[PDB]
Design a binder for this molecule. Structure first.
Ligand SMILES: C[N+](C)(C)CCO
Length: 402
């Protein structure tokens, strides 16, 4: 049963991430439908990031007080309710219903990203703890990819509002059915199971570690760049490539899939050899190089040089993500991995909000190129900061005991 739980959690986190990116994947179509500017539809993606921060601590308290069964049940139930609430928005003048459904979905997310560590800890031993967490993360990333690919094929950019409403209805039905099925699966399979047998202080100890602070800032930069790029991919891509929404979705799918492949490669490299600082430095440098190449080859007229560049940049830009968590645990082994992962995630959300809003404004007022140079400048600053990191690998030193 232990793997049924993982395969259900991965699937419904996938559904939640699809619900995150379904709007930014067809940003322009939704703009036309609801009649709102790009900024308003841009906020249906920053709702997740904004809601993640304040609700993280209550989520941890609820987990520690009630157990994993009820947390997973609540996450799936909120995901289903948020998915089905949006069905009241199938009209040009009901954007508030959508931005309420997305809020309910975002509240569900907070019960997702922190679970996989505990799921692996409670359902798996040492020989299988890593694989469960990796599978959950890959499920979430595949959710992002599917949300990038499916909407533009299920929602053609037709001028008529009624036919567009019908297509959006089809998409929301296909997501609500999945959410309901996965909620049933969570109620059935996600049986409660106990193990066989401070936070302020721990956070103070961590922040006393300047290396962890530098890692937090660098991970925030990278993850926020990824989130802003994912949210704004439709806006920039369609500007230079009119009437290519499906190809924008395919570009997003390529970015995310190359990201999963790079994450696998980086995980294997770290497991085989223990070089963390060098791996992170090279990953960040290659992410910066890919970002500059993507920025300065996007406006060339051929997706021949856009698919390849987006894939080869997203490869590293997303392989850095699990690597950041691993480096954080290595730097701060004595403290719980949950707190470090939570702080890295919070930094990611904050920098993602900042990057998304700033780059959206820059695209609106200055063009795509100034926004991409803004992102590239921030990414190179992050790369320099990471290169200025001293690797006091506590996990390796501690495990070297005997
Ligand atoms: C994009 N994710 C769903 C992975 C996190 C956003 O808060």
């Amino acid at each position: 049963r232990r793997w049924a739980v993982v395969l259900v959690f991965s699937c419904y986190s996938m559904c939640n991430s699809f619900q995150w990116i379904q709007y930014g994947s067809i940003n322009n179509i939704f703009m036309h439908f609801y009649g709102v500017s790009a900024f308003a539809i841009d906020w249906l993606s920053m709702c997740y990031m904004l809601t993640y921060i304040p609700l993280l601590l209550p989520v941890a308290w609820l987990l520690e007080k009630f157990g994993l069964r009820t947390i997973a049940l609540t996450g799936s139930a909120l995901n289903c309710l948020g998915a089905w609430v949006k069905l009241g928005s199938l009209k040009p003048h009901l954007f508030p219903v959508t931005v309420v459904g997305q809020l309910i979905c975002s509240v569900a997310q907070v019960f997702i990203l922190g679970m996989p560590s505990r799921i692996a800890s409670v359902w798996f031993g040492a020989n299988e703890v890593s694989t469960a967490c990796s599978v959950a993360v890959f499920g979430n990333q595949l959710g992002i990819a599917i949300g990038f690919l499916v909407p533009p094929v299920l929602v053609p950019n037709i001028e008529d509002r009624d036919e567009l409403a019908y297509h959006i209805s089809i998409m929301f039905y296909i997501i609500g059915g999945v959410a309901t099925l996965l909620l049933i699966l969570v109620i059935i399979v996600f049986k409660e199971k106990p193990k066989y047998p401070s936070y302020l202080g721990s956070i103070a100890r961590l922040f006393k570690n300047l290396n962890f602070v530098l890692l937090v800032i660098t991970y925030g930069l990278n993850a926020g760049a990824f989130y802003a790029l994912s949210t704004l991919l439709n806006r920039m891509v369609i500007w230079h490539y009119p009437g290519e929404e499906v190809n924008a979705g395919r570009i997003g799918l390529t970015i995310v899939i190359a990201g999963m492949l790079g994450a696998v490669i980086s995980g294997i490299w770290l497991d085989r050899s223990k070089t963390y600082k060098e791996t992170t430095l090279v990953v960040y440098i290659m992410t910066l190089v890919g970002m500059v190449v993507y920025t300065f080859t996007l406006n060339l007229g051929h997706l021949w040089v856009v698919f390849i560049t987006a894939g080869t940049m997203g490869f590293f830009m997303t392989g850095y993500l699990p690597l950041g968590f691993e480096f954080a645990v290595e730097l701060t082994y004595p403290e719980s991995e949950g707190i470090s992962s939570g702080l890295l995630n919070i930094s990611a959300q904050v920098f993602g909000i900042i990057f998304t809003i700033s780059q959206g404004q820059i695209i609106d007022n200055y063009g795509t190129k100034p926004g991409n140079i803004f992102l590239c400048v921030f990414l190179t600053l992050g790369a320099a900061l990471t290169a200025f990191i001293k690797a006091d690998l506590r996990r390796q030193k501690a495990n070297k005991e005997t």
